[PDB]
Design a protein around this ligand. Sequence first.
Ligand SMILES: O=c1ccn([C@@H]2O[C@H](COP(=O)(O)OP(=O)(O)OP(=O)(O)O)[C@@H](O)[C@H]2O)c(=O)[nH]1
Ligand SMILES: [Mg+2]
Ligand SMILES: [Mg+2]
Ligand SMILES: [Zn+2]
Ligand SMILES: [Zn+2]
Lengths: 164, 98, 43, 114, 783, 263, 85, 196, 133, 65, 49
Amino acid sequence: YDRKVPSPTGEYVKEPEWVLETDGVNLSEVMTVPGIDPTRIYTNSFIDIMEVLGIEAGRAALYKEVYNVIASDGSYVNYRHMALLVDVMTTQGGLTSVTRHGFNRSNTGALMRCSFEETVEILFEAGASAELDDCRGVSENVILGQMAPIGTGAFDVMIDEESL
Amino acid sequence: TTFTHCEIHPSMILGVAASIIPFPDHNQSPRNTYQSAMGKQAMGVFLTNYNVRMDTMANILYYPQKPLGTTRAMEYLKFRELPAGQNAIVAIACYSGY
Amino acid sequence: TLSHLRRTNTPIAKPRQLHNTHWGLVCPAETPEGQACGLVKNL
Amino acid sequence: MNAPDRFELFLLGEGESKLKIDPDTKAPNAVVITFEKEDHTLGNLIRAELLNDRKVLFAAYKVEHPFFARFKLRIQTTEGYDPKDALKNACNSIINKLGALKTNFETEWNLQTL
Amino acid sequence: RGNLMGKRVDFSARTVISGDPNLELDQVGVPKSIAKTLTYPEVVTPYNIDRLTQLVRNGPNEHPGAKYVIRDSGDRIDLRYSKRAGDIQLQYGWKVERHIMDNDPVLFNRQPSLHKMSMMAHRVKVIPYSTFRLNLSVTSPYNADFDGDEMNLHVPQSEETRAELSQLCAVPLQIVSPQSNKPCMGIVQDTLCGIRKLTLRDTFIELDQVLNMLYWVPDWDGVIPTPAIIKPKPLWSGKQILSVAIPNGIHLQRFDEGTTLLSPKDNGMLIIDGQIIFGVVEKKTVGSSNGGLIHVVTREKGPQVCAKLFGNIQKVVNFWLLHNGFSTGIGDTIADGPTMREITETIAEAKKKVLDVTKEAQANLLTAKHGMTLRESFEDNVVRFLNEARDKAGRLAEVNLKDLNNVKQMVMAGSKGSFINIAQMSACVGQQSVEGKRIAFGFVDRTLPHFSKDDYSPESKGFVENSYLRGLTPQEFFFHAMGGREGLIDTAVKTAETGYIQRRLVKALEDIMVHYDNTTRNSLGNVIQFIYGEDGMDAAHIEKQSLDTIGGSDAAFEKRYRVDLLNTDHTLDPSLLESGSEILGDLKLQVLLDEEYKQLVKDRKFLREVFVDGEANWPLPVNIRRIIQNAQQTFHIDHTKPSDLTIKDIVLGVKDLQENLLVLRGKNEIIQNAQRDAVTLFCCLLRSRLATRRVLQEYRLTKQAFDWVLSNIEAQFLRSVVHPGEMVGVLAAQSIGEPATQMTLNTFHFAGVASKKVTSGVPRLKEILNVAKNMKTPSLTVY
Amino acid sequence: EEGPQVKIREASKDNVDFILSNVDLAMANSLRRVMIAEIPTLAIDSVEVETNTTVLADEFIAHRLGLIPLQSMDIEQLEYSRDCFCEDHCDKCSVVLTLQAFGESESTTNVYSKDLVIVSNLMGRNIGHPIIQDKEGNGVLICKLRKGQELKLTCVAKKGIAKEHAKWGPAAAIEFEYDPWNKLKHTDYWYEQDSAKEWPQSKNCEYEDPPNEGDPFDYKAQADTFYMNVESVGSIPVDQVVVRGIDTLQKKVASILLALTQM
Amino acid sequence: EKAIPKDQRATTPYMTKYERARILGTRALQISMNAPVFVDLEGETDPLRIAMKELAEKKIPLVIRRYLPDGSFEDWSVEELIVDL
Amino acid sequence: ASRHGQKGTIGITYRREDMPFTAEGIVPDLIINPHAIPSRMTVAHLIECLLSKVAALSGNEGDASPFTDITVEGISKLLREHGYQSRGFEVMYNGHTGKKLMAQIFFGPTYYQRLRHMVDDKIHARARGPMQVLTRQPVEGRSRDGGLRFGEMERDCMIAHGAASFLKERLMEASDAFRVHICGICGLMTVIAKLN
Amino acid sequence: SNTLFDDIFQVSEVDPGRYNKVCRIEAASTTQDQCKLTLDINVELFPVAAQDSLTVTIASSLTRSWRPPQAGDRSLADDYDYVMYGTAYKFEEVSKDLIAVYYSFGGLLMRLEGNYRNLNNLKQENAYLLIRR
Amino acid sequence: MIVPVRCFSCGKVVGDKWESYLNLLQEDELDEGTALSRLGLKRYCCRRMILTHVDLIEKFLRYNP
Amino acid sequence: FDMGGYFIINGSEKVLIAQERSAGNIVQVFKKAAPSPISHVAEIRSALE
RNA sequence: AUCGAGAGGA
Ligand SMILES: O=c1ccn([C@@H]2O[C@H](COP(=O)(O)OP(=O)(O)OP(=O)(O)O)[C@@H](O)[C@H]2O)c(=O)[nH]1
Ligand SMILES: [Mg+2]
Ligand SMILES: [Mg+2]
Ligand SMILES: [Zn+2]
Ligand SMILES: [Zn+2]
């Protein structure tokens, strides 16, 4: 492998290194081995980087993968975006897929979450728990024909004096 | 060197509308498909009795024209007598912008 | 007319591909794009 | 059905008149003449002849949208020479070449056989 | 879904789109019969009364006119019939549903609409011929051509709806898109190829044209610029007259490959304001690149100004190319005889080098390769050799040009086509890729009936030997045909797949927006990240910048930032400062110069750990580099006159600005730390750039000066904040969900290597977002 | 005489070949063009169908008729219908034609523009003679008729100009060249191999001096001496086209020079 | 109550893009209904364009309520906001 | 449509007079674009046109057939005995000026197909027309005086922008809009608005 | 004003590097040893054969518009054959007193190097280049 | 479909000519090109008026009505 | 030039579009996936023509 | 005027 790293003389210098590559995973086992670096070992499975090193690492190995799909395709997307995706997937404690399994069962609205998948059976157990609705998310006010609290509707106008 | 059979002639792997494309062996192979998408949508002389039938929708070309360049195979599909196009003189040149 | 008369429909492991044995039976380039692509065939 | 009637290429519409001269907002001693219902046939001519006039600083023409015959030409001349005059003297000469090329053609014709 | 999140709507239209190289960026050509049937509920004001009363008489047929007249008493006065249509007494306080009119705000849309870009405000120019026409460089972000593409347009119905249309969705503003921190509209087609032509050193044009050309730019100040040549025949250089479109105070410097301020290659780029100095203009500059003209004009001058610029280039180049022609002819693929034998004898040497490999494994002398099949290596082994062949024998056609070769000129402009498009035809086609492997034994042990079984050479398994020019041999055709199908097949599948991933991604951040504390929240109001994108900066106000503090030697570093007043060798020679010889020696202010340097070495140690790799370029707000060139002009500076500042000016001043660069306002304590932390990186640059031995040695500022740069950096920073309200959820998804759709190969071209099948394409993105338990290609990569 | 010069080479009833000396490019082209568009002519405009039991549908028949040529000799003495004072059309502005073929034979019963009839009063002038160049006498095959097929329509032909439709164009194709060696370097000759061998020379090389490689490129050189050939569809004998051509080009420079005095 | 006092406002004094797009829009809705104008009209007669001149000379009587997430809010007048943008 | 999947719509009509021309006086029907070419890699399009001119000159039948002994070479040779730069091109003059064309331009006869579609039979507008009975939303079908959908997609783009009153307007003041009555206790629509 | 430079140069390299109307030239002065000059000439207008002495000057005059010459009674510093207008950019210093100015005439570039360009070539967005014989 | 009058691309009345082209090789046993060259068509835009042109009017007339 | 091959159902031209199916009475062998009990399976669609 | 299927456009 290529790896750029500082020579004593201050500057970066091209330096080679032997890197071992694998088919399969079992991290907590290889890393305890003699003669390897247990600080820079990496497996493409972000679901085991999570299991072994902890949610915070999880965040950025997921990122690394989301990334080594766009840049590897030769396209560029500014961090902030993939960060925010990676983040939303992470805050709820563990990993939370972007499917009707993960994020959508989450305790958001009711309307706002039925505008996605499994539309009725969400509205049902929304009347079994008698779950309340905020009406502060987007779709809520889309359905009700209100001016949703977004950019324009983020704030309230009025009505002052002033007039003297 | 152990043959048993021989092919009637290799332009016969083509279907009824590809056998209109002039020079299929000089196209990238997708675009050979597109001409068979269209060309079906391309109007000419659907039949000869067209002025005697009562059909919702009917398109007839004022002046149709046997192409200036055929497929040997065209001739059994009767294109040359019921053609679907015209012989335009085309100027592959960048111009006014449009 | 002269195509829509010689057409070939398939219901529903690699079905849309232009499988080798097609030679001289199904046209290799006459097919509808998107939707039901490769599934519909011409002779 | 959104098609501009043909005869709107040579007949002058209503209101619309054949010439419209306006001071050039930007350059000292300059003018922008708008030609309604007239184009390349006559725009190019007046420009490339008008460049021959030595007391002319600047001259150019452009059809602005191909959808309309209406073309513009803007003319800058030297202190003490009116833009409008410069056009008149240019137009006049073109008259003279073509009233000539007429009779010079006239006699070459007659003299030919078959 | 069908009826509440997505309603059928009123006051709209849809037709076919056309190019109009004579329309200006933010406009839309809306045909009469349409803006003859759309109306805007306009009230009766003493302001518009006169230009309204005449719309009534006129009615629904003549263009500028009206349909309905709306009174107070609910009642509608229908003036396409009516006894009273040919008069009316209009009071103030009624409504006159006038026809749509020239220069109005409308929303232009093109589906699939997957982009804060597929949706834009335009101005209306009513026109004959029943198409929407739109100008040529709004073509990239709507993603259309005109091949029968058609498009959508709704018309606002309320006075603010139309304000909120032009003050937010107006194309001009939307020039630089928050997806990629770079502009999404540029110069293309004719205009692009053309500008490369018009801008060659060879390219001169004389009086006759150089008059019309100048007249072709609408905001031209009526001054014929002095020509390059004045000797026999006064020629004007291409470059020269194009520099007439380029506005003032526009500075650009690039460098391509071997470029030397003298441009032997005539490559690179340098604009020293208004006029260009050298280089050749194409896609890398005049195109929607990262740091080219369009990106620079927009931040520097403004949207409205840049959106004018767009038009001005085209009017000219288009006009020039109008009267210069250019074309492409089959002969543009007729590559040279003495090379033809060369190309074909290069495949011939690749063909016989698969032999010896085949002859080897058939003799059982091939091993292993490690971590693969006996067979499986050979399969790899052959695709390499046969792509190696195609690509070498390709670049034998790329050299065999031919500058007056129409094709290369396009690829050489970057207007259309790529190297592969030139290797294909003229030279050879290559290996035919299916299911990642080369053509499969469809028939038992042979791919077609015209082969013998057990045949493992190139064309038995789908190498198309010839080009497109020579023509494809029957055998090959069907092969190309196959791989062909697969291409189409997994379009009507990659599209389908993407457009689910987009939607899922969308309905899943839907509502995460930036709030009025710069933290980022959802419906519940959970924090997701405490300062939008870890710094509080709207992506649109961002540029990659070199850091420099990272790279170079420590030796190189101590000859760039070390001002040792005490050391008679490392002071600022009186040459540089008005003080100088009075500052040498001294201790009172050396302790400040000292603790400047120490802060700068700690920068250097800090960055070295954040950016482990060395890579020194990173997207950061406020382009500093460009604020210097502005100061190096706005204040007309002579690199021979020796400043007027104190050291104290520089070192103290820069720290004060440092504290003035607000992002989070709170008066507490923890916040005042996140202030520091989200400002931290930017500052290391700022510290690196506005450092003493730089501000005097390299870019040679005055006081007067400087204070200007100081206030500017502040004023530009604050403008680069995220505007609380900014709906960031939709923006994230959209921005990762669109590349998705414009990806290729859910295989790859890692498939020469039949094991570096690391699962990407969409499939990867599907596995990640599904949070898959059973992933396809899992891997340790131990160090 | 004076300015711009002509030197005829060939002068048929249908073709004028000539050179044109000492003129601007700007003026040559603008004469080539005004030729195409802008020259008064006469063609069928208002076709009023009474019976048509043909294989051909109504407005087809009635589009050929337009294209069909009509003698436009004295066209300069016939008002535009847009200009006239009469309701729809009179003998001063429009000439009225009648076709009328019944079928009759067991054989196909062709219909030619020879078959048309003039009905309008001519006052006495050269207008409305369907132009017949065909040897046997029957120019332009309008339409076929089998047995009982009938066709009877009335025509009105109005004055017009090819800027409106191309039925009014008296031009056909216009051949036009200048400087056959490229000593103006207006172009730049493509080649994979060689300029001189790959492109053939014009039939016009005969008239002009070759270059002589030993000389530097003529820079202060100018656009001059153009190689025009004009065809004629047949409404106007070639000469008048290229006369009225020069004439119209002049006549509408007039209306400008004039318009200047008015406003 | 609730309302956070003038002294101790901790948001952006700089007017957001959205804020102004609505300010201009709401004043345009008034102006359109010929309700009283607060500046010398320099030939200008387009509702929207007038509002720009009024926001230019800071003579618009509308205070902005900004809602922080907990429920409280902050008040800025279009009289005291920076309109730099 | 060409015969290869160059598509295109007429962006403009031009008269002969404004159009580029070959010294013989010819004038195209048909003026596509260079760029049409490297992208799509249709070469046949280029051949078919070459050997098609040759077929207008000769009076011979052109032969396009697939796997034959036709080449560009075999053809050219058969054109530059009829007398035109043996790879197509032709020297032309801009129509506006009369000047020569600084680059010469492959020009030659070919097929073009007139497909359905176009235009005054999809062009459509609406400002309140008829609505459905089941939703009080406007009807589908151009013909039937429909109204074009603001699909959930669209909505997405509207939000990105933050232009929210317009998103409400698209969704109330056109399309639906309705006024119901609620009882401030129970919270449904039992209320019987005995109005006026 | 008035003039700023005057010398005679010996052409040492004509270079048709992928062009047809322009050539990069290479020359050093007869008068003084330590100097060198690079220039993009319009070879089609003034042909240059290698080893072919030329005389090279720089002025700043002989500001409103450029008007068509109309030399019925006009006067320039036109005694010469070949003349261009341009802009100076980088003011480079090759170590010690050696120095080199770079000029652009509508993209045609000039790299002049010497030492006694001294009190002469200020960044004046002026500078006409002139050549004779 | 009844031979055109004028050719499209130039407008040389190629109208009266069709019948003749049918004689010069039916009777005057000629080959194509040479028959066009004699008819008057140097320019292939007209020359392609008549070499492509297909005449169906021949068949519609065959239907009895 | 009509070749036929269609039917007429109330003034309307109706064509029968050939239908594909897997052939019967051919015995085929199929490998069956990893997470299931059965390694190999052989199938035959017996039906009388 | 609604429900059902197909054909076609990006
Ligand atoms: O952004 C683009 C758009 C289009 N193209 C060129 O066109 C295609 C990309 O977009 P399309 O897929 O729409 O072009 P297409 O040729 O496949 O279909 P048509 O729109 O012509 O009906 C590709 O084939 C490419 O050659 C690009 O290369 N980049
Ligand atoms: Mg495209
Ligand atoms: Mg499209
Ligand atoms: Zn009359
Ligand atoms: Zn013709």
